[PDB]
RNA sequence: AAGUUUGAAAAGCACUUUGGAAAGAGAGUGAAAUAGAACCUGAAGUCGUGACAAAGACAAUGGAAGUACCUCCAUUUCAAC
RNA sequence: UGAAAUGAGCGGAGUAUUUGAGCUGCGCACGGCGGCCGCACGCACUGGUUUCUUCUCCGUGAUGCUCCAUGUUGGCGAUGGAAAUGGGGUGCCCCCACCCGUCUUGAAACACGGACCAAGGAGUCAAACAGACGCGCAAGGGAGGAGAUAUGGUUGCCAGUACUUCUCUCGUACUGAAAGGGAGAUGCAAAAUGCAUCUGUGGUGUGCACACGUCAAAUCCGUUUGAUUUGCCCAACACC
RNA sequence: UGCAAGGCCGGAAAGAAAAGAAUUAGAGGCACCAAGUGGGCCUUCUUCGGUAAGCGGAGCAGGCGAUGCGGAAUGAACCGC
RNA sequence: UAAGCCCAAUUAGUGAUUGCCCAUUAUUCCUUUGGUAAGGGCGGAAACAAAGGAGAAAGUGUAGCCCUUCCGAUGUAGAUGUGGCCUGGAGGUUAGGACGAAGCUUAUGGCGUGAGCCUAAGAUGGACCGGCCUCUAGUGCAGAUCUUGGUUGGCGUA
């Protein structure tokens, strides 16, 4: 019949199965609640901005928008004929391959880093849909040094070990709002590897202002990425 | 004295029972139930072993080494013969009484022996039927002593 | 064995690891120790300083036998004392007698701490060795 | 050239929308050999025995803007001796 | 014949291939050899006192641990 | 005996890697030799030239070494060698060595038919 | 097409098998590979890694060094606690300079005859690594030791002896040769004994 | 685009698509447009007074 | 330079026929005669012949993918399959 | 082709859950005028209304360590000088495609060697040294040359194997040109060879494991896996 | 009791706040033994001699050499990769 | 009424923001190979004759223990590795051969990424010889105005 150590393993595995199902249910409920809260926060923030703009326009004033805090950066040139400073900057940006895409904080250090590699990278200000699409379709985590596709919230919770980041919507919120754990989330992910933009580019050798591709194109980066994603 | 691990390290690369033909490492060890050249199947090497053998009459013989007489080569292996029609599970239990890690292969080998006996009988019958119509100019008969 | 050399690995390489440009020529730098002061100066200077020049007096007919003077330290005297001799040895009692010249030593040196006290017969001794061996309850006996 | 894909120009198909309508349709190239070889219904329909052979393919996607189509034949590619020759584009499989 | 005289063309690339190594830190290889002699002698005397003090403290710690 | 069914056998390349320009000189064997010429267009990988073997052409390990019958070849020299393949008769087939004579081959073939052991070159019958 | 420049500089030379042909070393490697994989303790991992190493990197250790470090551990060790097992993954060699040693339990790959005799005579025990695995599978209450390699003549010969600050021995069969030009100030210069770094 | 994976990552995606369907509703959209225009125009006209 | 290394044994091709002869065609010895004499095996290269594949002039060769035709080859199937 | 279907998708059960959009309460926030007047409908009450919109809950471990084995409808296959598939040949079509080896910044070169084939043809052996790795012993290691005797035997195996050196050599100690001198620790101390003891890292900084706890995370609740405090610190590095 | 230097004992430690307030496909150090190479050429930009040169000579950096592939009809180096 | 030049666009003041073609590039799928590789299983769970099967090795490296999962793959000179291939001998160990051994021939197939290995057929041969572990070397040819031998177009030509 069944050996003693086999029976002990059977009991332990039964307990493990029960615990795993309970943990899956709890994580699902927590993720649902967090996603609801983030959705309501986003909608409220947009409505608040709309009302502020309307109040400004009503009395002849202007509304200055908040300077964007996050930029999404993609490499649009190959790896040939790169000067050492640009090569080092692109290595620090984890943009080692063409159409590699990352999120960075739009502050003075990073802004001056991006100014020196502008001919190589097209960048701009991501929308919520862009962040969600990249995380859901192109999102990969660094797990034991391996590039592992995000398929469940349990792996996210195991990767980050942070109460603030237990699901994909926590990652989307941290990236989009530049939260306390922005660097943790973005560094925990593998650099995004995108397809070429379906429909073609304009000109990789010219700035977007000149009719090319390589500049800061503000929120127009979203159409470019939507074709790339 | 000298453990099975040490002997296996000594003989894994070079041995008379290892048959490296092509790139396949088989084993013509008579106490190997499988023909694979592994430490588990080397019946000539392990302290205890059990190998399923054919017997005359379609019977199955189980050869067992116990490790009690491993220093007496003519007393090392004791043969037990199972009458024809024996369940392969009974042979599997006879083997597993000495080595539980050879139960599945011993069951498969006992069933294989039964199939081999039945097919050998059929092929012999067919050959005898074919031979009844040949002239056979020469026939050799061994003398009796 | 010939089957382990780089020659076997280089069959079909056409150059055997000497290059297409420099090639393998007979003596591209001279023979032996040539040029130690010209075109091999850096190698000699950084790897064999002191190689050139003269130093010291000459000794025309040098004989090693008169100069024979091997030495042993105090903390190595157990190598000459046997096991039961070492076990039965203490200050004020019967001590093993060590004959240095029969054991192949001429001078007794004083490095370390003597473990088992003993009477040492030596041709030579340092002052520190003599002082220490007397302080430990042993002695040194001069011999020729 | 890459011979695993072939380009077929069909009469009265001069727009990418028409070629899209033809995506997935079966495609046949009919020729003849020198001998009479095996065929479908060789035994059932001995009247089909002939030197005539056929290579079958399907329309994979439109090509360009002017009604050209990309065709891939089953396994082997279509021979270059068919360049400039007739191609049969049937109306099946039917989506309408 | 005439050849090229001098260039530094590939030399920075070669220097950075194994990188320009950072300096040995200040706490390593801080030898005082060649420094101002009176200060070195005074510091040597202080260090000898400190070695005596360290031996004394170790003996006291062993004694305290044994007594406990 | 029937061989064990495996995944469909896929060969990355059927043509052999033959030595460069061996058809022009009768003394050159077709056996592959790595071109080490400085200007060699095969070594430099020009588009219209023949290819060089590399690790990417290696066969799928699941179906590697499997003959078209589905079995794997094991050289066999006498009757006693048949019993090594008895338990694995659906995986290995016996290949009688070329230098085994017709007499011992008759013995081997008879025993292999009795044992239901496939022979790759055991002629005729079944 | 990924810009991986110097990625091969990151790779280090890691060996997972032994060059040793000794079958008993193979058995120990098997045992401690299993132990390091299946037990959480870092002692087993270090022991397996050292068993993989080469002969030059498993340097011998004297018996006197073991006695000194074990005494240094014995003070500040509670008298109730038993003394640790000294574990060396090389050879243990006797030391004629230390006649009196305590009763120590020493585990080593090999003992010299004199070292084994000394340990047994002092009241201690020479342990074998499989005995250690049976009596301490995790490595609890052990003293893992290494031999000294800084005093080997190969190390004393490493580096150029002609650069300033260098005190390496030259490769010279004759000692009286190579003593004049770069060695004495009177022979036009002397290699400086010290150099700030 | 995969329902299994999208729902696994975001359990709240059912409510979001329900709200999207509500917004796409023609009667709902037209009523909302009329109400929004009236409401915003009234608010602006009151604000400028 | 050159192994006289035919064959177990000369049993070293009697005899007939054409040919001036050399030889040929038969016959015979031999287990073998493309074992016939400085003769065991008899390679490559080159050449002859019969059959077949065709093929302008793209020097030829070569790669990749098909197809026509052939295949003394390798497998698998032939029936509730 | 269900040999594990994880499914908003396959089952079971409920007519509901709660998303959003409308309308709207209180306070705050925001705007204007400088406390009021406005609030486009922002935040908290996870506010109210359900007028429109919407699927809502549960659910199966592996007692499968691994690999391989499962539909439908026709055609072709009924032992055939068969069918089929895969290999080989030869020709053709479309496309692709400069002559090899070499020196050279640069070769298809109007740079050199290149009619064919067979056989042959080029990092070897010895000695000194050193480094890596494998062995054996280790404060010791090892010969060598010779001896004896199994063998004072045997055609030959056997020119091998077996055995022994108060020796020799390398090392355990360096240094000076030489004369010739020659290295432990601690304590008390301050003697131009000080004295006492001998279970001992000369000291400091950084430093595996181990021991002691203390934290955080994940836990099948047994633990593991990352710190990190203290002690000892091995090996190593640095300063004395 | 001040200063200087070695220590010892305690304290406090956003482990480095907020102000755009870094980032990293960030294992840091330490050796040992050796090979080829030591004729270079081209290019953006800067530059010297020369009327100039597909000339001679330098600086920063990319290439070719050592490298094909896709483009500029063709071209070591141009564009893309 | 460009198929030229300078500007613009993407099916056109219609109702929104991807015309189309081509890479050894990008994304993705399959397979190979190597990691500074990352993990799981390995105490045979129980049962099971013939007239669901087989395997399961504590392992650098093989036909790799087995499975899962990531990442990288070009390269002269040059280095290194390879239970990587091949040749003549030596210790071993297993075989084979007059019912045909080595040599030789091939539209003669199979296996291997390859060096190569194996089978088949000789209407070839007529006596030796294969596999595996280890030891050993006069151990691999396409070219050196290479050596020797033979052949050869020029040529039935001068
Ligand atoms: K020939
Ligand atoms: K063809
Ligand atoms: Mg373009
Ligand atoms: Mg450019
Ligand atoms: Mg069982
Ligand atoms: Mg060559
Ligand atoms: Mg070399
Ligand atoms: Mg040179
Ligand atoms: Mg003088
Ligand atoms: Mg120069
Ligand atoms: Mg092949
Ligand atoms: Mg070149
Ligand atoms: Mg043959
Ligand atoms: Mg030393
Ligand atoms: Mg001759
Ligand atoms: Mg006859
Ligand atoms: Mg013949
Ligand atoms: Mg002949
Ligand atoms: Mg449902
Ligand atoms: Mg040359
Ligand atoms: Mg030139
Ligand atoms: Mg050339
Ligand atoms: Mg020219
Ligand atoms: Mg020349
Ligand atoms: Mg001797
Ligand atoms: Mg010394
Ligand atoms: Mg800050
Ligand atoms: Mg040169
Ligand atoms: Mg020039
Ligand atoms: Mg060059
Ligand atoms: Mg062009
Ligand atoms: Mg090379
Ligand atoms: Mg030879
Ligand atoms: Mg041919
Ligand atoms: Mg040779
Ligand atoms: Mg040759
Ligand atoms: Mg001629
Ligand atoms: Na012919
Ligand atoms: Na000696």
PDB file of C-alpha atoms in Angstrom, chain A residues 8-186:
ATOM      1  CA  UNK A   8       2.861  12.554   4.924  1.00  0.00           C
ATOM      2  CA  UNK A   9       3.551  14.157   1.544  1.00  0.00           C
ATOM      3  CA  UNK A  10      -0.101  13.555   0.637  1.00  0.00           C
ATOM      4  CA  UNK A  11      -1.303  15.411   3.739  1.00  0.00           C
ATOM      5  CA  UNK A  12       1.127  18.285   3.184  1.00  0.00           C
ATOM      6  CA  UNK A  13       0.110  18.574  -0.472  1.00  0.00           C
ATOM      7  CA  UNK A  14      -3.595  18.602   0.408  1.00  0.00           C
ATOM      8  CA  UNK A  15      -2.983  21.448   2.856  1.00  0.00           C
ATOM      9  CA  UNK A  16      -0.888  23.249   0.232  1.00  0.00           C
ATOM     10  CA  UNK A  17      -3.655  22.944  -2.371  1.00  0.00           C
ATOM     11  CA  UNK A  18      -6.257  24.347   0.035  1.00  0.00           C
ATOM     12  CA  UNK A  19      -3.979  27.244   0.970  1.00  0.00           C
ATOM     13  CA  UNK A  20      -3.117  27.989  -2.667  1.00  0.00           C
ATOM     14  CA  UNK A  21      -6.777  28.172  -3.695  1.00  0.00           C
ATOM     15  CA  UNK A  22      -7.538  30.449  -0.737  1.00  0.00           C
ATOM     16  CA  UNK A  23      -4.588  32.698  -1.617  1.00  0.00           C
ATOM     17  CA  UNK A  24      -5.688  32.903  -5.254  1.00  0.00           C
ATOM     18  CA  UNK A  25      -9.173  33.982  -4.178  1.00  0.00           C
ATOM     19  CA  UNK A  26      -7.823  36.591  -1.748  1.00  0.00           C
ATOM     20  CA  UNK A  27      -5.459  38.044  -4.350  1.00  0.00           C
ATOM     21  CA  UNK A  28      -8.302  38.217  -6.879  1.00  0.00           C
ATOM     22  CA  UNK A  29     -10.474  40.156  -4.420  1.00  0.00           C
ATOM     23  CA  UNK A  30      -7.650  42.551  -3.508  1.00  0.00           C
ATOM     24  CA  UNK A  31      -6.804  43.160  -7.175  1.00  0.00           C
ATOM     25  CA  UNK A  32     -10.468  43.824  -7.965  1.00  0.00           C
ATOM     26  CA  UNK A  33     -10.728  46.413  -5.185  1.00  0.00           C
ATOM     27  CA  UNK A  34      -7.471  48.134  -6.145  1.00  0.00           C
ATOM     28  CA  UNK A  35      -8.471  48.288  -9.816  1.00  0.00           C
ATOM     29  CA  UNK A  36     -11.829  49.830  -8.908  1.00  0.00           C
ATOM     30  CA  UNK A  37     -10.113  52.462  -6.766  1.00  0.00           C
ATOM     31  CA  UNK A  38      -7.583  53.340  -9.479  1.00  0.00           C
ATOM     32  CA  UNK A  39     -10.307  53.604 -12.127  1.00  0.00           C
ATOM     33  CA  UNK A  40     -12.352  55.977  -9.978  1.00  0.00           C
ATOM     34  CA  UNK A  41      -9.250  58.045  -9.186  1.00  0.00           C
ATOM     35  CA  UNK A  42      -8.328  58.407 -12.869  1.00  0.00           C
ATOM     36  CA  UNK A  43     -11.839  59.444 -13.879  1.00  0.00           C
ATOM     37  CA  UNK A  44     -12.077  61.944 -11.030  1.00  0.00           C
ATOM     38  CA  UNK A  45      -8.703  63.469 -11.893  1.00  0.00           C
ATOM     39  CA  UNK A  46      -9.684  63.940 -15.531  1.00  0.00           C
ATOM     40  CA  UNK A  47     -13.038  65.491 -14.587  1.00  0.00           C
ATOM     41  CA  UNK A  48     -11.295  67.814 -12.123  1.00  0.00           C
ATOM     42  CA  UNK A  49      -8.883  68.991 -14.821  1.00  0.00           C
ATOM     43  CA  UNK A  50     -11.806  69.542 -17.212  1.00  0.00           C
ATOM     44  CA  UNK A  51     -13.637  71.689 -14.657  1.00  0.00           C
ATOM     45  CA  UNK A  52     -10.479  73.670 -13.857  1.00  0.00           C
ATOM     46  CA  UNK A  53      -9.963  74.429 -17.548  1.00  0.00           C
ATOM     47  CA  UNK A  54     -13.605  75.484 -17.909  1.00  0.00           C
ATOM     48  CA  UNK A  55     -13.373  77.799 -14.891  1.00  0.00           C
ATOM     49  CA  UNK A  56     -10.166  79.304 -16.282  1.00  0.00           C
ATOM     50  CA  UNK A  57     -11.757  79.880 -19.693  1.00  0.00           C
ATOM     51  CA  UNK A  58     -14.933  81.339 -18.179  1.00  0.00           C
ATOM     52  CA  UNK A  59     -13.154  84.317 -16.577  1.00  0.00           C
ATOM     53  CA  UNK A  60     -10.596  85.030 -19.298  1.00  0.00           C
ATOM     54  CA  UNK A  61      -7.767  83.186 -17.542  1.00  0.00           C
ATOM     55  CA  UNK A  62      -5.582  80.251 -18.541  1.00  0.00           C
ATOM     56  CA  UNK A  63      -4.893  76.889 -16.935  1.00  0.00           C
ATOM     57  CA  UNK A  64      -1.269  75.764 -16.900  1.00  0.00           C
ATOM     58  CA  UNK A  65      -1.093  71.989 -17.152  1.00  0.00           C
ATOM     59  CA  UNK A  66       1.194  70.100 -14.803  1.00  0.00           C
ATOM     60  CA  UNK A  67       4.546  69.378 -16.407  1.00  0.00           C
ATOM     61  CA  UNK A  68       4.510  65.668 -17.334  1.00  0.00           C
ATOM     62  CA  UNK A  69       6.332  63.452 -14.855  1.00  0.00           C
ATOM     63  CA  UNK A  70       6.713  60.303 -16.982  1.00  0.00           C
ATOM     64  CA  UNK A  71       8.159  59.841 -20.455  1.00  0.00           C
ATOM     65  CA  UNK A  72       8.054  56.723 -22.618  1.00  0.00           C
ATOM     66  CA  UNK A  73      11.217  56.262 -24.672  1.00  0.00           C
ATOM     67  CA  UNK A  74      11.823  53.926 -27.613  1.00  0.00           C
ATOM     68  CA  UNK A  75      15.025  53.327 -29.574  1.00  0.00           C
ATOM     69  CA  UNK A  76      14.542  53.846 -33.311  1.00  0.00           C
ATOM     70  CA  UNK A  77      18.088  53.235 -34.581  1.00  0.00           C
ATOM     71  CA  UNK A  78      20.207  50.119 -34.798  1.00  0.00           C
ATOM     72  CA  UNK A  79      23.371  49.463 -32.840  1.00  0.00           C
ATOM     73  CA  UNK A  80      25.908  50.562 -35.480  1.00  0.00           C
ATOM     74  CA  UNK A  81      28.134  53.660 -35.359  1.00  0.00           C
ATOM     75  CA  UNK A  82      27.327  55.042 -31.908  1.00  0.00           C
ATOM     76  CA  UNK A  83      29.607  57.435 -30.039  1.00  0.00           C
ATOM     77  CA  UNK A  84      30.774  56.365 -26.552  1.00  0.00           C
ATOM     78  CA  UNK A  85      28.679  58.922 -24.647  1.00  0.00           C
ATOM     79  CA  UNK A  86      25.490  58.040 -26.526  1.00  0.00           C
ATOM     80  CA  UNK A  87      26.303  54.333 -26.194  1.00  0.00           C
ATOM     81  CA  UNK A  88      26.729  54.662 -22.421  1.00  0.00           C
ATOM     82  CA  UNK A  89      23.514  56.685 -22.083  1.00  0.00           C
ATOM     83  CA  UNK A  90      21.521  54.121 -24.072  1.00  0.00           C
ATOM     84  CA  UNK A  91      23.001  51.323 -21.949  1.00  0.00           C
ATOM     85  CA  UNK A  92      21.917  53.174 -18.800  1.00  0.00           C
ATOM     86  CA  UNK A  93      18.459  53.575 -20.351  1.00  0.00           C
ATOM     87  CA  UNK A  94      18.331  49.812 -21.093  1.00  0.00           C
ATOM     88  CA  UNK A  95      17.703  50.673 -24.762  1.00  0.00           C
ATOM     89  CA  UNK A  96      20.226  48.208 -26.150  1.00  0.00           C
ATOM     90  CA  UNK A  97      18.129  47.223 -29.186  1.00  0.00           C
ATOM     91  CA  UNK A  98      15.991  48.982 -31.774  1.00  0.00           C
ATOM     92  CA  UNK A  99      12.351  49.423 -30.664  1.00  0.00           C
ATOM     93  CA  UNK A 100      13.255  48.661 -27.065  1.00  0.00           C
ATOM     94  CA  UNK A 101      10.930  50.812 -24.973  1.00  0.00           C
ATOM     95  CA  UNK A 102      11.148  51.961 -21.350  1.00  0.00           C
ATOM     96  CA  UNK A 103       9.458  54.401 -18.998  1.00  0.00           C
ATOM     97  CA  UNK A 104      11.587  57.080 -17.343  1.00  0.00           C
ATOM     98  CA  UNK A 105      10.917  59.902 -14.914  1.00  0.00           C
ATOM     99  CA  UNK A 106      10.754  63.292 -16.646  1.00  0.00           C
ATOM    100  CA  UNK A 107      13.118  65.192 -14.359  1.00  0.00           C
ATOM    101  CA  UNK A 108      16.194  67.325 -15.019  1.00  0.00           C
ATOM    102  CA  UNK A 109      18.767  64.464 -14.769  1.00  0.00           C
ATOM    103  CA  UNK A 110      16.840  62.175 -17.114  1.00  0.00           C
ATOM    104  CA  UNK A 111      15.833  65.070 -19.373  1.00  0.00           C
ATOM    105  CA  UNK A 112      19.473  66.030 -19.903  1.00  0.00           C
ATOM    106  CA  UNK A 113      20.333  62.356 -20.421  1.00  0.00           C
ATOM    107  CA  UNK A 114      17.688  62.113 -23.172  1.00  0.00           C
ATOM    108  CA  UNK A 115      18.822  65.371 -24.808  1.00  0.00           C
ATOM    109  CA  UNK A 116      22.180  63.770 -25.674  1.00  0.00           C
ATOM    110  CA  UNK A 117      20.716  60.694 -27.417  1.00  0.00           C
ATOM    111  CA  UNK A 118      17.819  62.372 -29.232  1.00  0.00           C
ATOM    112  CA  UNK A 119      18.825  61.167 -32.755  1.00  0.00           C
ATOM    113  CA  UNK A 120      18.484  57.561 -31.545  1.00  0.00           C
ATOM    114  CA  UNK A 121      15.262  57.623 -29.501  1.00  0.00           C
ATOM    115  CA  UNK A 122      11.734  58.859 -30.163  1.00  0.00           C
ATOM    116  CA  UNK A 123       9.912  59.688 -26.949  1.00  0.00           C
ATOM    117  CA  UNK A 124       6.902  61.452 -25.529  1.00  0.00           C
ATOM    118  CA  UNK A 125       4.284  61.441 -22.809  1.00  0.00           C
ATOM    119  CA  UNK A 126       2.396  58.156 -22.347  1.00  0.00           C
ATOM    120  CA  UNK A 127      -1.347  57.917 -21.938  1.00  0.00           C
ATOM    121  CA  UNK A 128      -3.120  55.540 -19.580  1.00  0.00           C
ATOM    122  CA  UNK A 129      -4.069  53.259 -22.474  1.00  0.00           C
ATOM    123  CA  UNK A 130      -0.452  53.118 -23.652  1.00  0.00           C
ATOM    124  CA  UNK A 131       0.774  52.142 -20.178  1.00  0.00           C
ATOM    125  CA  UNK A 132      -1.930  49.485 -19.841  1.00  0.00           C
ATOM    126  CA  UNK A 133      -1.332  48.083 -23.326  1.00  0.00           C
ATOM    127  CA  UNK A 134       2.418  47.854 -22.784  1.00  0.00           C
ATOM    128  CA  UNK A 135       2.080  46.200 -19.373  1.00  0.00           C
ATOM    129  CA  UNK A 136      -0.600  43.725 -20.480  1.00  0.00           C
ATOM    130  CA  UNK A 137       0.726  42.711 -23.904  1.00  0.00           C
ATOM    131  CA  UNK A 138       4.465  43.483 -23.784  1.00  0.00           C
ATOM    132  CA  UNK A 139       5.062  43.313 -20.029  1.00  0.00           C
ATOM    133  CA  UNK A 140       7.820  41.013 -18.796  1.00  0.00           C
ATOM    134  CA  UNK A 141       9.324  40.704 -15.330  1.00  0.00           C
ATOM    135  CA  UNK A 142      12.880  40.004 -14.197  1.00  0.00           C
ATOM    136  CA  UNK A 143      12.438  36.788 -12.203  1.00  0.00           C
ATOM    137  CA  UNK A 144      15.698  35.080 -11.201  1.00  0.00           C
ATOM    138  CA  UNK A 145      17.295  36.981 -14.076  1.00  0.00           C
ATOM    139  CA  UNK A 146      14.880  35.490 -16.623  1.00  0.00           C
ATOM    140  CA  UNK A 147      12.488  37.307 -18.952  1.00  0.00           C
ATOM    141  CA  UNK A 148       9.138  35.935 -17.761  1.00  0.00           C
ATOM    142  CA  UNK A 149       5.840  37.065 -19.263  1.00  0.00           C
ATOM    143  CA  UNK A 150       3.330  38.563 -16.829  1.00  0.00           C
ATOM    144  CA  UNK A 151       0.417  36.115 -16.816  1.00  0.00           C
ATOM    145  CA  UNK A 152      -0.973  36.297 -13.263  1.00  0.00           C
ATOM    146  CA  UNK A 153      -0.968  38.625 -10.278  1.00  0.00           C
ATOM    147  CA  UNK A 154       0.658  36.037  -7.996  1.00  0.00           C
ATOM    148  CA  UNK A 155       3.934  36.295  -9.907  1.00  0.00           C
ATOM    149  CA  UNK A 156       3.805  40.099  -9.605  1.00  0.00           C
ATOM    150  CA  UNK A 157       3.279  39.845  -5.848  1.00  0.00           C
ATOM    151  CA  UNK A 158       6.125  37.325  -5.566  1.00  0.00           C
ATOM    152  CA  UNK A 159       8.439  39.517  -7.654  1.00  0.00           C
ATOM    153  CA  UNK A 160       7.912  42.804  -5.855  1.00  0.00           C
ATOM    154  CA  UNK A 161       7.197  41.662  -2.260  1.00  0.00           C
ATOM    155  CA  UNK A 162       5.554  45.040  -1.630  1.00  0.00           C
ATOM    156  CA  UNK A 163       2.089  45.600  -0.185  1.00  0.00           C
ATOM    157  CA  UNK A 164       1.620  48.500  -2.619  1.00  0.00           C
ATOM    158  CA  UNK A 165       2.323  46.342  -5.713  1.00  0.00           C
ATOM    159  CA  UNK A 166       0.326  43.094  -5.799  1.00  0.00           C
ATOM    160  CA  UNK A 167      -1.270  43.186  -9.272  1.00  0.00           C
ATOM    161  CA  UNK A 168      -0.919  44.541 -12.800  1.00  0.00           C
ATOM    162  CA  UNK A 169      -3.093  47.560 -11.994  1.00  0.00           C
ATOM    163  CA  UNK A 170      -0.715  48.522  -9.178  1.00  0.00           C
ATOM    164  CA  UNK A 171       2.109  48.507 -11.738  1.00  0.00           C
ATOM    165  CA  UNK A 172       0.031  50.567 -14.180  1.00  0.00           C
ATOM    166  CA  UNK A 173      -0.773  53.083 -11.436  1.00  0.00           C
ATOM    167  CA  UNK A 174       2.851  53.381 -10.303  1.00  0.00           C
ATOM    168  CA  UNK A 175       4.068  53.895 -13.874  1.00  0.00           C
ATOM    169  CA  UNK A 176       1.326  56.301 -14.964  1.00  0.00           C
ATOM    170  CA  UNK A 177       1.212  58.486 -11.842  1.00  0.00           C
ATOM    171  CA  UNK A 178       4.960  58.288 -11.050  1.00  0.00           C
ATOM    172  CA  UNK A 179       4.288  56.924  -7.583  1.00  0.00           C
ATOM    173  CA  UNK A 180       6.552  56.139  -4.660  1.00  0.00           C
ATOM    174  CA  UNK A 181       7.528  52.821  -6.274  1.00  0.00           C
ATOM    175  CA  UNK A 182       7.982  53.966  -9.880  1.00  0.00           C
ATOM    176  CA  UNK A 183      11.661  53.012  -9.987  1.00  0.00           C
ATOM    177  CA  UNK A 184      10.961  49.685  -8.283  1.00  0.00           C
ATOM    178  CA  UNK A 185       8.244  48.777 -10.789  1.00  0.00           C
ATOM    179  CA  UNK A 186      10.137  49.866 -13.899  1.00  0.00           C
TER     180      UNK A 186
END
